[PDB]
Design an enzyme around this catalytic site. Structure first.
Site, PDB file in Angstrom:
ATOM      1  N   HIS A  44      11.248  99.707  38.616  1.00 52.84           N
ATOM      2  CA  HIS A  44      11.996 100.946  38.858  1.00 52.84           C
ATOM      3  C   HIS A  44      11.135 102.097  39.346  1.00 52.84           C
ATOM      4  O   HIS A  44      11.620 102.971  40.066  1.00 52.84           O
ATOM      5  CB  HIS A  44      12.772 101.435  37.615  1.00 52.84           C
ATOM      6  CG  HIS A  44      14.166 100.908  37.539  1.00 52.84           C
ATOM      7  ND1 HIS A  44      15.217 101.645  37.042  1.00 52.84           N
ATOM      8  CD2 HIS A  44      14.678  99.692  37.853  1.00 52.84           C
ATOM      9  CE1 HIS A  44      16.316 100.904  37.043  1.00 52.84           C
ATOM     10  NE2 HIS A  44      16.017  99.714  37.528  1.00 52.84           N
ATOM     11  N   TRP A  95      20.540  86.456  31.242  1.00 47.83           N
ATOM     12  CA  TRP A  95      20.745  85.615  32.419  1.00 47.83           C
ATOM     13  C   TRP A  95      20.422  84.158  32.054  1.00 47.83           C
ATOM     14  O   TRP A  95      20.784  83.213  32.760  1.00 47.83           O
ATOM     15  CB  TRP A  95      19.786  86.065  33.528  1.00 47.83           C
ATOM     16  CG  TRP A  95      20.106  87.387  34.149  1.00 47.83           C
ATOM     17  CD1 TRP A  95      20.952  87.615  35.210  1.00 47.83           C
ATOM     18  CD2 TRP A  95      19.540  88.667  33.804  1.00 47.83           C
ATOM     19  NE1 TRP A  95      20.939  88.949  35.549  1.00 47.83           N
ATOM     20  CE2 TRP A  95      20.084  89.620  34.704  1.00 47.83           C
ATOM     21  CE3 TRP A  95      18.618  89.098  32.829  1.00 47.83           C
ATOM     22  CZ2 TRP A  95      19.738  90.984  34.656  1.00 47.83           C
ATOM     23  CZ3 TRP A  95      18.270  90.456  32.777  1.00 47.83           C
ATOM     24  CH2 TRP A  95      18.835  91.383  33.693  1.00 47.83           C
ATOM     25  N   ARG A 109      10.602  95.681  34.265  1.00 46.68           N
ATOM     26  CA  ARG A 109      11.667  96.517  34.853  1.00 46.68           C
ATOM     27  C   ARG A 109      11.136  97.910  35.138  1.00 46.68           C
ATOM     28  O   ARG A 109      11.535  98.559  36.114  1.00 46.68           O
ATOM     29  CB  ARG A 109      12.881  96.612  33.896  1.00 46.68           C
ATOM     30  CG  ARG A 109      14.109  97.359  34.459  1.00 46.68           C
ATOM     31  CD  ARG A 109      15.135  97.704  33.352  1.00 46.68           C
ATOM     32  NE  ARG A 109      16.101  98.728  33.774  1.00 46.68           N
ATOM     33  CZ  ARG A 109      16.679  99.603  32.954  1.00 46.68           C
ATOM     34  NH1 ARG A 109      16.406  99.593  31.656  1.00 46.68           N
ATOM     35  NH2 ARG A 109      17.516 100.509  33.432  1.00 46.68           N
TER      36      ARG A 109
HETATM   37  C1  HEM Z   1      19.805  94.099  43.364  1.00 45.06           C
HETATM   38  C2  HEM Z   1      18.655  94.570  42.610  1.00 45.06           C
HETATM   39  C3  HEM Z   1      18.704  94.777  41.191  1.00 45.06           C
HETATM   40  C4  HEM Z   1      19.719  95.229  40.413  1.00 45.06           C
HETATM   41  C5  HEM Z   1      21.081  95.770  40.862  1.00 45.06           C
HETATM   42  C6  HEM Z   1      19.229  95.192  38.993  1.00 45.06           C
HETATM   43  C7  HEM Z   1      19.978  95.572  37.917  1.00 45.06           C
HETATM   44  C8  HEM Z   1      19.533  95.457  36.578  1.00 45.06           C
HETATM   45  C9  HEM Z   1      20.346  95.848  35.465  1.00 45.06           C
HETATM   46  C10 HEM Z   1      21.831  96.370  35.489  1.00 45.06           C
HETATM   47  C11 HEM Z   1      19.580  95.482  34.366  1.00 45.06           C
HETATM   48  C12 HEM Z   1      19.968  95.630  32.887  1.00 45.06           C
HETATM   49  C13 HEM Z   1      19.305  96.868  32.273  1.00 45.06           C
HETATM   50  C14 HEM Z   1      19.745  97.107  30.816  1.00 45.06           C
HETATM   51  O1  HEM Z   1      20.966  97.205  30.571  1.00 45.06           O
HETATM   52  O2  HEM Z   1      18.869  97.185  29.930  1.00 45.06           O
HETATM   53  C15 HEM Z   1      18.321  94.973  34.816  1.00 45.06           C
HETATM   54  C16 HEM Z   1      17.285  94.499  33.958  1.00 45.06           C
HETATM   55  C17 HEM Z   1      16.081  93.962  34.401  1.00 45.06           C
HETATM   56  N1  HEM Z   1      15.685  93.892  35.722  1.00 45.06           N
HETATM   57 FE1  HEM Z   1      16.866  94.104  37.315  1.00 45.06          FE
HETATM   58  N2  HEM Z   1      17.935  94.640  38.915  1.00 45.06           N
HETATM   59  C18 HEM Z   1      17.581  94.501  40.281  1.00 45.06           C
HETATM   60  C19 HEM Z   1      16.344  94.082  40.727  1.00 45.06           C
HETATM   61  C20 HEM Z   1      15.268  93.761  39.850  1.00 45.06           C
HETATM   62  C21 HEM Z   1      13.978  93.406  40.331  1.00 45.06           C
HETATM   63  C22 HEM Z   1      13.551  93.343  41.784  1.00 45.06           C
HETATM   64  C23 HEM Z   1      13.162  93.274  39.252  1.00 45.06           C
HETATM   65  C24 HEM Z   1      11.788  93.062  39.125  1.00 45.06           C
HETATM   66  C25 HEM Z   1      10.969  92.342  40.010  1.00 45.06           C
HETATM   67  C26 HEM Z   1      14.033  93.480  38.102  1.00 45.06           C
HETATM   68  C27 HEM Z   1      13.568  93.335  36.736  1.00 45.06           C
HETATM   69  C28 HEM Z   1      14.427  93.467  35.644  1.00 45.06           C
HETATM   70  C29 HEM Z   1      14.042  93.139  34.265  1.00 45.06           C
HETATM   71  C30 HEM Z   1      12.793  92.317  33.867  1.00 45.06           C
HETATM   72  C31 HEM Z   1      15.077  93.442  33.510  1.00 45.06           C
HETATM   73  C32 HEM Z   1      15.267  93.165  31.983  1.00 45.06           C
HETATM   74  C33 HEM Z   1      14.961  94.504  31.264  1.00 45.06           C
HETATM   75  C34 HEM Z   1      15.052  94.412  29.717  1.00 45.06           C
HETATM   76  O3  HEM Z   1      15.331  93.329  29.160  1.00 45.06           O
HETATM   77  O4  HEM Z   1      14.848  95.464  29.080  1.00 45.06           O
HETATM   78  N3  HEM Z   1      15.317  93.787  38.513  1.00 45.06           N
HETATM   79  N4  HEM Z   1      18.306  94.904  36.183  1.00 45.06           N
END
Ligand code: HEM
Ligand code: HEC
Ligand code: HEC
EC number: 1.11.1.5
Lengths: 294, 108, 108
Positions: A52, A191, A48
Site C-alpha cells: 500500500h 483466500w 500489505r
Molecule cells: C486488485 C488489487 C488489489 C486489491 C483490490 C486488494 C484488496 C485487498 C483487500 C480488500 C484486502 C483485505 C484487507 C483487510 O480487510 O484487512 C487485502 C489484503 C491483503 N492484500 Fe491485497 N489487494 C490488491 C493487491 C494486493 C497486492 C498487489 C499485494 C501485495 C503484493 C496485496 C497484499 C495483501 C495482503 C498480504 C493482504 C492480507 C492483509 C492481512 O491479512 O492483514 N494485495 N487486499
C-alpha cells in the site's frame, strides 16, 4: 523548472550487514509476537503495508511511491483504503527506534521483503536508499485499487504502476497471505488455509474450488467456496479474463515459476519511482533466519 | 524429543488456538484442511483413511508416539520436508508437552 | 408454470447488474460479448444473426422457454458445456424468477 526525480541515497557507512540486522530484528519480532490476528502473525499485514505504501505511485508524474515514506503522515495514515495497516505501523515502531538511521520508506519496504522471506516465499532482492520527504509530498487518498471491480479495471489500474499482465497476476498471488477482515475492508474471510506460508495456493483455490457469488454482512458481494475461502471480485476477475486465466493456470501448476515472477514484480513495485545511481550497490538478498541456523 | 506429561487444559487451549483451524480430534470426526487426528498415536503417518496426504508425509512412515510427535511439532517442515501442513511449530517444550498431553486424551 | 414468475423491477436491476456488461435486449440492439437477446424466447439457441456462437451453443439447439432458460442460468457450463458465456449462474430461484420475468417482457 520541471518534474520530480527521487535519487537513491543510502546513509553514510550503512551497508549490507546493517540492513541484515534490521531484517533479523523484524523476523525475530515476527516470531515473538505471534498471537496477532488469531496467530496468523504480522507477516501478511506487513506485506500489505509494503504494497500500500508503494502502490500510491503514479508513473505519469512520479508522485507517491515508497520513496518518501509519507504513510507516516496523517492524511495517508487515515486513508480508508489503509484501514488495519496501523497494525503493521505499530509493529515496526520499536524496530525503527532500535535502528533510527533507517529511512521510513526503507523500513516499510524491508518489512514486506522480510515477511515474504520468513513465510518461506521467494528471495526478494532489495535496495536501500529511500529518503523521507516532507508532509506536503503526501499523496491524497484514492490511489489504491477498489476490490469490487472487474478485470478491465484491474488491468488499467496496474498500468499506472507500470505493471503488465504477468506482473499483475504474480503480484496478486500475495493473497495467499492473511485474510480480509470485515471491520477493515467490508470483506470477510481467507483466500486459503495456509495463511502465513507463501505458496501458490491462491491460484490453486481460484481454479479448484466451487465458487458462489454471495453478499456478506457488510452488504458487499464476494465469491465464497464450501471450504470457507473467499475471493474478492477483483481476484475472481483473474479467471474471468482469458489472458489472466492462462497465467493463473501456469502458476497453479508451477510454484517455482510463480516465485520467480513474483520476486521480480514485488521488487519492481518496491522500487517504482526511484532513480538509482549507476554506481549504486547491487541489490541485497538477505539470508532468512533459517539460513542462519536460527 | 522426549515427552513429559503436562497440562491437558493448557494443551486444549493450544489445540484450539493453533490446530483446530485445520484438524478435528473426535472419533469419526471429519477431515478438513488437515486429517482428523483421532487414533493418531500408534498409527503410521499418512494412514488416515479418506484423506489425501502429501507424498512426503506418507513416505516418512513414522509410527506416531508422544516423542516423535514432539519432534514433529517443534518444526514440521524440518521433520517431514515438503509436508503441506502450514505451521512453523511450537518451539517451547512446555508447550509441546501440554499439547501432546491433551492430544493423547482427546484422540485416545 | 413449473417456474413461478416474479418482480420485473427487480429482474431489471439483476439484468443491468449481471448481464448488461455483455448483452442488450432492445430490438436491433448490438451484439456485445454476448448476442442481442431480443426475441430470445421462442427461438432456438444459437440463432441470433451476425453473432458468432461456439459450435456448442449451436449444436444444443433448444427452444428458449422460460423453463430450459432457468436451468441454463443456474449454471451455463453444465447446461451447454463448452459454451463461452462466462457467468457463474444464479443460485437463487427468486433471482431467476425476477430476471426471467424481466426478460420475458424486455425481449418481446
Ligand atoms: C486488485 C488489487 C488489489 C486489491 C483490490 C486488494 C484488496 C485487498 C483487500 C480488500 C484486502 C483485505 C484487507 C483487510 O480487510 O484487512 C487485502 C489484503 C491483503 N492484500 Fe491485497 N489487494 C490488491 C493487491 C494486493 C497486492 C498487489 C499485494 C501485495 C503484493 C496485496 C497484499 C495483501 C495482503 C498480504 C493482504 C492480507 C492483509 C492481512 O491479512 O492483514 N494485495 N487486499
Ligand atoms: C493451516 C493448517 C494446519 C494447521 C494450523 C495445523 N495442521 Fe497439522 N496438518 C495439516 C495438513 C494439511 C496436514 C497434512 C500434511 C501432509 O499431507 O503433508 C497435517 C498433518 C498433521 C499431522 C500428521 C497426520 C498423519 O496422519 O500423518 C499431525 C500429527 C498434525 N498435522 C498435527 C497438528 C497439530 C497438533 C497442529 C497444531 C499445533 C496442527 N496440526 C496444525 C494442516 C494443519
Ligand atoms: C461475460 C460475458 C457474459 C455475461 C456476464 C452474460 N452473458 Fe449470456 N452470453 C455470453 C456469450 C459470449 C454468449 C454466447 C456463448 C457461446 O456462444 O457459447 C451468451 C449466450 C447467452 C444466451 C444464449 C443466446 C442464444 O442465442 O442461444 C442467453 C439466453 C444469455 N447469454 C443470457 C444471459 C443472461 C440472462 C445473463 C445474466 C444473468 C448473461 N447472459 C450473462 C456472454 C455473457
Amino acid at each position: 523548472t520541471t518534474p520530480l526525480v527521487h535519487v537513491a541515497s543510502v546513509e553514510k557507512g550503512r551497508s549490507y550487514e546493517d540492513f541484515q540486522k534490521v531484517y533479523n530484528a523484524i523476523a525475530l519480532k515476527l516470531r515473538e509476537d505471534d498471537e496477532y490476528d488469531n496467530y496468523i502473525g504480522y507477516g501478511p499485514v506487513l506485506v500489505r503495508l509494503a504494497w500500500h505504501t508503494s502502490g500510491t505511485w503514479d508513473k505519469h508524474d512520479n508522485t507517491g511511491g515508497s520513496y518518501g515514506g509519507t504513510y507516516r503522515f496523517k492524511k495517508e495514515f487515515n486513508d480508508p483504503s489503509n484501514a488495519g495497516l496501523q497494525n503493521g505501523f505499530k509493529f515496526l515502531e520499536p524496530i525503527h527506534k532500535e535502528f533510527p538511521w533507517i529511512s521510513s520508506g526503507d523500513l516499510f519496504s524491508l518489512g514486506g521483503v522480510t515477511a515474504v522471506q520468513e513465510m518461506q516465499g521467494p528471495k526478494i532482492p532489495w535496495r536501500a536508499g529511500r529518503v523521507d520527504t516532507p508532509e506536503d509530498t503526501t499523496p491524497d487518498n484514492g490511489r489504491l485499487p477498489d476490490a469490487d471491480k472487474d478485470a478491465d479495471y484491474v488491468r488499467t489500474f496496474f498500468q499506472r504502476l507500470n505493471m503488465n499482465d504477468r506482473e499483475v497476476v504474480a503480484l496478486m498471488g500475495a493473497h495467499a497471505l492473511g485474510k480480509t477482515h470485515l471491520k477493515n475492508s467490508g470483506y470477510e474471510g481467507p483466500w486459503g488455509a495456509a495463511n502465513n506460508c507463501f505458496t501458490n495456493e491462491f491460484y490453486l483455490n481460484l481454479l479448484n474450488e466451487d465458487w458462489k457469488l454471495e453478499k456478506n454482512d457488510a452488504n458487499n458481494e464476494q465469491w465464497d467456496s464450501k471450504s470457507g475461502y473467499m475471493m474478492l471480485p477483483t481476484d475472481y476477475s483473474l479467471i474471468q479474463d482469458p489472458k489472466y486465466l492462462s497465467i493463473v493456470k501456469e502458476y497453479a501448476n508451477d510454484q517455482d515459476k510463480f516465485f520467480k515472477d513474483f520476486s521480480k514484480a514485488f521488487e519492481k513495485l518496491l522500487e517504482n519511482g526511484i532513480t538509482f545511481p549507476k554506481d549504486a550497490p547491487s541489490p541485497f538478498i538477505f539470508k532468512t533466519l533459517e539460513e542462519q541456523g536460527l | 524429543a522426549e515427552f513429559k506429561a503436562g497440562s491437558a487444559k493448557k494443551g486444549a487451549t493450544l489445540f484450539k488456538t493453533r490446530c483446530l483451524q485445520c484438524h478435528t480430534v473426535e472419533k469419526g470426526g471429519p477431515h478438513k484442511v488437515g486429517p482428523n487426528l483421532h487414533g493418531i498415536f500408534g498409527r503410521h503417518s499418512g494412514q488416515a483413511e479418506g484423506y489425501s496426504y502429501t507424498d512426503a508425509n506418507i513416505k516418512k512412515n513414522v509410527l506416531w508416539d508422544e516423542n516423535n510427535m514432539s519432534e514433529y511439532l517443534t518444526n514440521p517442515k524440518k521433520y517431514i520436508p515438503g509436508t503441506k501442513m502450514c505451521f512453523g511449530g511450537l518451539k517451547k517444550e512446555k508447550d509441546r508437552n501440554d499439547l501432546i498431553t491433551y492430544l493423547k486424551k482427546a484422540t485416545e
